[PDB]
């Protein structure tokens, strides 16, 4: 009734914007937009642009993805 996943994926953020998310530079050398969940948000975090993170892009648009993981 649900079945679909995603390319989960490491990315650097390059720039910080409001309505809480983001920019990410992939090593590929493209740019991705990339949004923050609910999950990362309850472990309390304050993470700023230049920090490396996991982004989660969506098989509905390669264009966006989210970060749900940043390194230590």
């Given at each position: ?21 983001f ?48 390194k230590?």
């Amino acid at each position: 009734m649900a079945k679909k996943d995603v390319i989960e994926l490491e990315g650097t953020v390059s720039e910080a914007l409001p309505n809480a998310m983001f920019k990410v530079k992939l090593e590929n050398g493209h740019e991705i937009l990339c949004h923050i969940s609910g999950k990362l948000r309850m472990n309390f975090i304050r993470i700023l642009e230049g920090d490396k993170v996991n982004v989660e892009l969506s098989p509905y648009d390669l264009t966006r993805g989210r970060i749900t993981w940043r390194k230590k």
